[PDB]
Amino acid sequence: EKQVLNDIRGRYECYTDVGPSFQSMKQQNRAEILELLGKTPQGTPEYQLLLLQYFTLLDGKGVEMMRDYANKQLIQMGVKKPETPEEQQWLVEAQQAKQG
Amino acid sequence: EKQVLNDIRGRYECYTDVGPSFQSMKQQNRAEILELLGKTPQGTPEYQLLLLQYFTLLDGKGVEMMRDYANKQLIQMGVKKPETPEEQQWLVEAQQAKQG
């Protein structure tokens, strides 16, 4: 925008509703996925959700190793699509496609 | 930093929340992984968590042997990424990739 205030009048695009209180957006997204689990079979879409869960976990010694693994996994799954802080190269060695 | 005090004013990057009390960061990380277990199938990501658990265990005669095994395992899994106190060579004999 420009200057201290400058919002288009095409504002109200979201309607208001109620639901469980969360501390932060990441909190909700984490819970939203756990709900998506269990209500889904041990089929394939389960694994993506499962991975996505690890993806959302916040700092740790345990969580870091798993979060990164889940990321690489999801990018090489092709479904992630790199955020590109470095994940670009994560896709690079993934692009080879059974190249060895 | 420089001198006795020198913090940038880009401080407050973490918001405060409550949760179970732990004696130390390692305590929490340990518990955080145990929670991640059971809530996950006997699939593949179970094993990494399982190993990670051994990884986090503190000194012992029993735990040392297992912790080291889990480390090597995780590094040769490729997911660990060496801390390099010596684990560099742990990856060396791992780099060969079925070389024999």
Swiss-Prot record, chains A, B:
It is found in: Virion. Coiled coil: none annotated. It comes from the Viruses. Signal peptide: none annotated. Forms the portal vertex of the capsid. This portal plays critical roles in head assembly, genome packaging, neck/tail attachment, and genome ejection. Procapsid assembly may initiate with a nucleation complex composed of portal and scaffolding proteins. The portal protein multimerizes as a single ring-shaped homododecamer arranged around a central channel. Switches upon genome packaging from an asymmetrical conformation in the procapsid (PC-portal) to a symmetrical ring in the mature capsid (MV-portal). This change of conformation may serve as a signal for headful packaging. Homododecamer. Interacts with the terminase large subunit; this interaction allows the packaging of viral DNA. Interacts (via C-terminus) with the head-to-tail adapter protein gp4; this interaction participates in the head completion. Interacts with the scaffolding protein; this interaction initiates procapsid assembly, thereby ensuring incorporation of only one portal ring per capsid. Interacts with the capsid protein. Belongs to the p22likevirus portal protein family. This is Portal protein. The lineage of its organism: Viruses, Duplodnaviria, Heunggongvirae, Uroviricota, Caudoviricetes. The chain holds residues 503 to 602 of 725 of the full protein.
